[PDB]
Structure 1
Amino acid sequence: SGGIERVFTDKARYNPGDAVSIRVQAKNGTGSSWSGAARLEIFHLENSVYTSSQSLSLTNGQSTTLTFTWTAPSTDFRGYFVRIDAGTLGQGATAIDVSSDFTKYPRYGYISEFESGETALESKAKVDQLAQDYHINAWQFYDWMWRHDKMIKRTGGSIDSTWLDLFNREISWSTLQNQIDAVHDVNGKAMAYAMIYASRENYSPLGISPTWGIYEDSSHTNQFDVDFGDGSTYLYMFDPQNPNWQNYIHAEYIDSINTAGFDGIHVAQMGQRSNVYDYNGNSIDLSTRFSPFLDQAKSVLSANNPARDNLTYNIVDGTVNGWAVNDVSKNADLDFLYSEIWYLSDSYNQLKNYIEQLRANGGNKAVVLAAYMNYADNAGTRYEAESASMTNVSTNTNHAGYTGSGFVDQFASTGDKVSFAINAPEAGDYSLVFRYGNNTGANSTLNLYVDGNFVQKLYFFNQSSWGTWKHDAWYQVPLTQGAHTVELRYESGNVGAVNLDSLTLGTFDEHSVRLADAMMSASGATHIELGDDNQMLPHEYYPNRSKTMRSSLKNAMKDHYNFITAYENLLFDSDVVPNDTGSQFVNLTGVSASGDGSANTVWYINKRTSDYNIVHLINLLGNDNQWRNTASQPSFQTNLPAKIYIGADETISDVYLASPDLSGGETQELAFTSGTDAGGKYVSFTVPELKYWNMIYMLEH
């Protein structure tokens, strides 16, 4: 299908009645002149709702961009699938969301970089790329602010043109305003990251009072804090129910909306803290104190500007009945729910049950998860340090836990070097990740050279023994396709020493990422995972680029995001509920099945709306039951016979199967038969292909 290179729209979301411009980028590479038609067809679920055609002739090697126009139908909150057929030139797909309000079907991305060198054109391109490729309709702006308690830096009444954030990055006001403008141009919303309860160090000259603080004891001796490890930089924590702190920080939220032009506030927190006291020594349960803060915040935001009053709150460490889970999801006036998952919902099934709880508690508000894929894994192509070209250092095996046949030791003085000969299979960004040991008692440093040029000085953190390997020393660089040299040098001005195990081209595992996203969306949530210039999120610190997506995963993500936009009505509507009572059952011939996301099975998940019986098949054949870690390619299946049991209450008019894995998400209608036996009333068919994820939607009269 390689002639049709891109299919996309001008915006990420449309109001009913809007003109939608569908673009088709085509290039003739058949080796000789081509003449024919490009045929557009738009579907809402199983139903075709628009078709149109344009003739197309291209000389060998010739490219062009067609435009089809369409008016968004008048029914609000509907997703559409888009097919482009150009015959022998190939085909393509995209999707369209018609929604007056993104908080119904949020597709959340992020921006975390605000360099002054970034032009308005480049800011537009990075927003356009996410909007066009994935229909991202909201961006979380991460670490834009000057201080947590003084977000826009001013000299007198004048906004400073740049400022340094808490890690000393330079934030450009003009770059930030350009990005916000670009987001608004695609009908996106810009959400400002802000803490619920943080000031920075030395807060009293800003008129903030310790008497508004939360404390670790009843004598106001130690205020809860966050220690960034340099002996100066901290956050201090405050009581979200305190009316003075609310006054203070809600005014900063408002300033951010009105001055910077944000469309809402993404309210963050640090997560569970125990045995909390106010300044006067009253014992308080912090977990029930967010909801009153958030209700009040929503009130002043909505009063200030009903169009820029969006609000969510991070439920940190999400799990069924987790800390603050019930109080927030049930009582807080939020537009959608957001939760960062750590280690309390490690299996696919646990995480499914948590999403389900959030959906039920919130009255089927939208749910977005932050769930950093491959977080603990040194995923990617590995080059063993002991197999590299090393100067004035030699190999060893005398501390356990190394990969390969050993590691490089005593990397500790001027003239020492290790040079890796790597290959980039495609042009693009590469995360260069070093697994190392350092027990010198302080940070150690080395200079990084790529193809003979100095790129950065890198820091290698002190660990607690020499048998303690880490892989948090990394740097991302652009590489051309083919051979390169990556070199670490101990030069003048470097300090300490390291053991070096390996270099890895830090890469998100395509397989795990597809399974996790399928699981989440089939359960009823989306996933904040894409941001900046086509980065995927590796870590809670969003500017982290310790892993990169390769092209094969970028395509799978385009398909996935096309799929969750096109079928948003079947995945995320307030209609959509679990179909969990009745002993409902799926039988697959030749493969192990399971209803609870067991290892090495095809998982079925049962959902429904008033019109459809929906069955998701998620293919864990050949893989474990953990969602975050790396995975192998699933055992793909062909012509899989299936039979789905249904309440005798139900009669099924049609069987439809759509998958982001198959023909871009396009629905196929399947022939099926009904019957009855010992197991109850059933329907039966052949699934032609299961790779990662199939959604079966079956129409009921």
Structure 2
Amino acid sequence: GGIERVFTDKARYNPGDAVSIRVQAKNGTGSSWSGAARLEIFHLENSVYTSSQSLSLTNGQSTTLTFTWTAPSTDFRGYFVRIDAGTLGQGATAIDVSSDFTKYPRYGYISEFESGETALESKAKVDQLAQDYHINAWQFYDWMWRHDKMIKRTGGSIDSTWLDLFNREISWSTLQNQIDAVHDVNGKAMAYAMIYASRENYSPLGISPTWGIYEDSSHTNQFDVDVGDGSTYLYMFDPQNPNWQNYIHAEYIDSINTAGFDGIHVAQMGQRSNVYDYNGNSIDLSTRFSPFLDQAKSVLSANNPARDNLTYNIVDGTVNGWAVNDVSKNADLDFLYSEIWYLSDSYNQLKNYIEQLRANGGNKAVVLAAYMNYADNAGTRYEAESASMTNVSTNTNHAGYTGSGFVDQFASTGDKVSFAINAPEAGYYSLVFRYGNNTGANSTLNLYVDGNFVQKLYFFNQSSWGTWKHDVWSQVPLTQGAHTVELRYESGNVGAVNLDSLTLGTFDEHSVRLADAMMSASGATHIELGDDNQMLPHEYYPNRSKTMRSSLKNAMKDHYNFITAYENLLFDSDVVPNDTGSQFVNLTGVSASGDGSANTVWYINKRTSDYNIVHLINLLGNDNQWRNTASQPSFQTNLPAKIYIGADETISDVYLASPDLSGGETQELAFTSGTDAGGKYVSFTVPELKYWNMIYMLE
């Protein structure tokens, strides 16, 4: 398919906006090509536009066609887009018509703001997410100077740079440029801010400890957060206290008006117990965010209804988890957001949590933060003891190492380890080192790639020498083919390490497709893409300890088209579970389950006013954790399926759309029904199941 890309200028359109569908093509079949480009746009199963254009290309040549469309007056509609060019190829994209991003958030992030970033580089990184995945809002992570003094001013004047709490340079022009670029794609820019945090030494800013929350009832220890340099701390505060609300809401408003943000992403540290105010009163923090969020929304909307967007992080998401009910039910948020840790590990546990959220929020959209392959050091491993070491030998004395051993006593000047690696395709590669360090402090080593120094690299001190870690990395660009990565213990390097391996930090395509399918099926979206086409590997968004390869980038384009086009079926306000009916799916040859059981095909049972919807999630040959890496599922071809229904439900037609299958185009299938011992049925053959099928049946 030498139809290379299909996309749109903007990332969400309004009803009646012009819409420019672009089509990048390129002939590479030896000799000229003449024919047409047949654009066809669907709403679920109904073609609603069709158009054609002449196209001829010599061998080798490229062009970009524009097709122009008018978004239909019906607000809040997702559309599939087909382009066919006969033997040249095909491609696809989706279009979302919504006056408001908060009905169908597709949430990304920006976390870098270097002053070396030209306005053009800024526009290019934003355009890529907008075009490839239809992002409609970006969370700006760690843009602020201080958590309690977000825009840094000298007098009245705004400082053109400032240093954030890990000492990064944040550039105001870069920041402003990004927000404009976001705004070009009719994007929205959400500002990160904590609900309760000041930085240290907050008194001369006129913040009062009397507004604080405390570990005890003598106001002797304020809750805090050691960021870990001995100076830099977050101190926590009472969200219901009016003076705190006043102080911090003011900086919220300052950010909207001064920086041009469209709303605020309010965060929190999560759960805390046996909590007191300054005066000594015991208080349940879990119920206290809703009042603050309510008042937040109220001043944001008075300040400016066009830029009054709001959400809150419900941290450690699970069914009836901490502050889960109070926030989701009573907090005046525009869409719900939750960071999942280790209390919803099964695909099913997580399906049930999203379900609770949708229920409690009145089917208002849910986004999850769920960092994939977090625990796992995934990607291609290059063993340190297979490699080329100057002045150091292998050992096997401390345990937990991988392959045959590791390199010891990387202690002394002129020590060296060199990895002869190969990079399948051009692009960014995460260099992830597994190490030991029990020196007593940080150890350092210098990182050379292809004879050039990249970085000094700090290895953290650990409990024992038997304690291995892989949380030291460097992202570097690479041409396809052989390359040399080496560490040198040079002059200025300190301490010592054991070295176990180099891994090319890579997200695992299989886990991720499944995790996303699961979430979208269940009714959610996943903040997972940001900056220059990075995927989110950690809670600290600037972490680049893992990269997607072309393969997963393709999968996500397919996926994000999918949850854009069929968004009315996944996320609309009347898309509810279809649970009360002993409902059952029968599959010939393969065992199924409705509770996401390892090594099965998981049917999930949802419905709307007009459609009966089954999702199938191929867990064949794979376990039931959502977060861990995975094997390629057992691909099923020509698969007989049987679906049961209520006696008052007759099926006009039956459709199956899947992102694993023709970019997610809908296909109609052959089917009749009858009746038998286990209720009234309907049946058909599933042509292919790979990762995720969305069967939707019109009634």
CA distance in 1, matches of 2:31, 2:560: 34
Post-superposition offset of 1:43: 0.1
Post-superposition offset of 1:428: 0.2
Post-superposition offset of 1:392: 0.3
List per-residue Cα deviations over 1:93-140 (Å, max 9, x = no partner). 000000000000000000000000000000000000000000000000
CA distance in 2, matches of 1:412, 1:640: 60
Post-superposition offset of 1:39: 0.4
CA distance in 2, matches of 1:142, 1:494: 32
CA distance in 1, matches of 2:206, 2:678: 70
List per-residue Cα deviations over 1:544-600 (Å, max 9, x = no partner). 000000000000000000000000000000010000001000000000100000000
Show the counterpart of 1:500.
499
Counterpart secondary structure, 1:11? coil
Instruction: Give the 5 Å matches for 1:634-645.
Output: 634-645=633-644
List per-residue Cα deviations over 1:320-361 (Å, max 9, x = no partner). 000000000000000000000000000000000000000000
Show the counterpart of 1:327.
326
Show the counterpart of 2:347.
348
Post-superposition offset of 1:3: 1.0
List per-residue Cα deviations over 1:654-675 (Å, max 9, x = no partner). 0000000000000000010101
CA distance in 2, matches of 1:348, 1:18: 39
CA distance in 2, matches of 1:229, 1:549: 30
CA distance in 2, matches of 1:422, 1:213: 53
List per-residue Cα deviations over 1:173-208 (Å, max 9, x = no partner). 000000000000000000000000000000000000
CA distance in 2, matches of 1:624, 1:329: 30
Post-superposition offset of 1:146: 0.2
Counterpart secondary structure, 1:430? strand
CA distance in 2, matches of 1:180, 1:452: 38
Post-superposition offset of 1:319: 0.1
List per-residue Cα deviations over 1:354-394 (Å, max 9, x = no partner). 00000000000000000000000000000000000000000
Post-superposition offset of 1:252: 0.1
Post-superposition offset of 1:247: 0.2
Show the counterpart of 1:241.
240
Post-superposition offset of 1:416: 0.5
**1:661 to 2:642 alignment:** no
CA distance in 2, matches of 1:185, 1:117: 21
CA distance in 1, matches of 2:448, 2:78: 48
CA distance in 2, matches of 1:359, 1:422: 47
Post-superposition offset of 1:230: 1.1
Post-superposition offset of 1:601: 0.2
List per-residue Cα deviations over 1:381-416 (Å, max 9, x = no partner). 000000000000000000110000000000001011
List per-residue Cα deviations over 1:435-488 (Å, max 9, x = no partner). 000011110000000000000000100000111100001000000000100000
CA distance in 2, matches of 1:502, 1:575: 50
Structure 1: 5+ residue stretches without partners: none
List per-residue Cα deviations over 1:137-167 (Å, max 9, x = no partner). 0000000000000000000000000000000
CA distance in 1, matches of 2:522, 2:473: 34
Show the counterpart of 1:533.
532
CA distance in 1, matches of 2:314, 2:87: 50
Structure 1's consecutive aligned runs of 4 or more residues displaced over 3 angstroms after TM superposition are none
Show the counterpart of 1:112.
111
Counterpart secondary structure, 2:355? helix
CA distance in 2, matches of 1:454, 1:243: 52
RMSD: 0.3
Counterpart secondary structure, 1:352? helix
CA distance in 2, matches of 1:68, 1:582: 46
List per-residue Cα deviations over 1:225-259 (Å, max 9, x = no partner). 00011110000000000000000000000000000
CA distance in 2, matches of 1:269, 1:400: 38
Q: TM-score, normalised by structure 1?
A: 1.00
Post-superposition offset of 1:5: 0.2
Counterpart secondary structure, 1:307? helix
Post-superposition offset of 1:629: 0.3
Show the counterpart of 1:52.
51
CA distance in 2, matches of 1:413, 1:87: 64
CA distance in 2, matches of 1:39, 1:546: 42
Show the counterpart of 2:681.
682
CA distance in 1, matches of 2:9, 2:540: 30
Counterpart secondary structure, 1:635? coil
Post-superposition offset of 1:266: 0.0
Counterpart secondary structure, 2:408? strand
Q: TM-score, normalised by structure 2?
A: 1.00
Counterpart secondary structure, 1:455? strand
CA distance in 1, matches of 2:179, 2:584: 48
Counterpart secondary structure, 1:633? coil
Post-superposition offset of 1:525: 0.2
Show the counterpart of 2:194.
195
Counterpart secondary structure, 2:685? strand
CA distance in 1, matches of 2:562, 2:335: 21
CA distance in 2, matches of 1:338, 1:215: 26
Show the counterpart of 1:34.
33
Counterpart secondary structure, 2:409? strand
Post-superposition offset of 1:644: 0.2
Post-superposition offset of 1:649: 1.4
Show the counterpart of 2:588.
589
Counterpart secondary structure, 1:435? strand
CA distance in 1, matches of 2:3, 2:139: 32
CA distance in 2, matches of 1:240, 1:649: 50
CA distance in 2, matches of 1:509, 1:357: 28
Show the counterpart of 1:671.
670
CA distance in 2, matches of 1:668, 1:396: 58
Counterpart secondary structure, 1:590? coil
Counterpart secondary structure, 2:380? strand
Show the counterpart of 1:270.
269
CA distance in 2, matches of 1:489, 1:472: 19
Post-superposition offset of 1:261: 0.2
The percent identity for this pair of structures is 99
Counterpart secondary structure, 1:96? strand
List per-residue Cα deviations over 1:2-23 (Å, max 9, x = no partner). 2100000010000000000000
List per-residue Cα deviations over 1:50-74 (Å, max 9, x = no partner). 0000010001100000000000001
**1:97 to 2:96 alignment:** yes
CA distance in 2, matches of 1:681, 1:653: 15
CA distance in 2, matches of 1:31, 1:573: 47
CA distance in 1, matches of 2:552, 2:591: 27
**1:165 to 2:164 alignment:** yes
Structure 2: 5+ residue stretches without partners: none
Counterpart secondary structure, 1:615? strand
Counterpart secondary structure, 1:673? coil
CA distance in 2, matches of 1:48, 1:369: 32
CA distance in 1, matches of 2:497, 2:40: 59
Aligned residues: 699
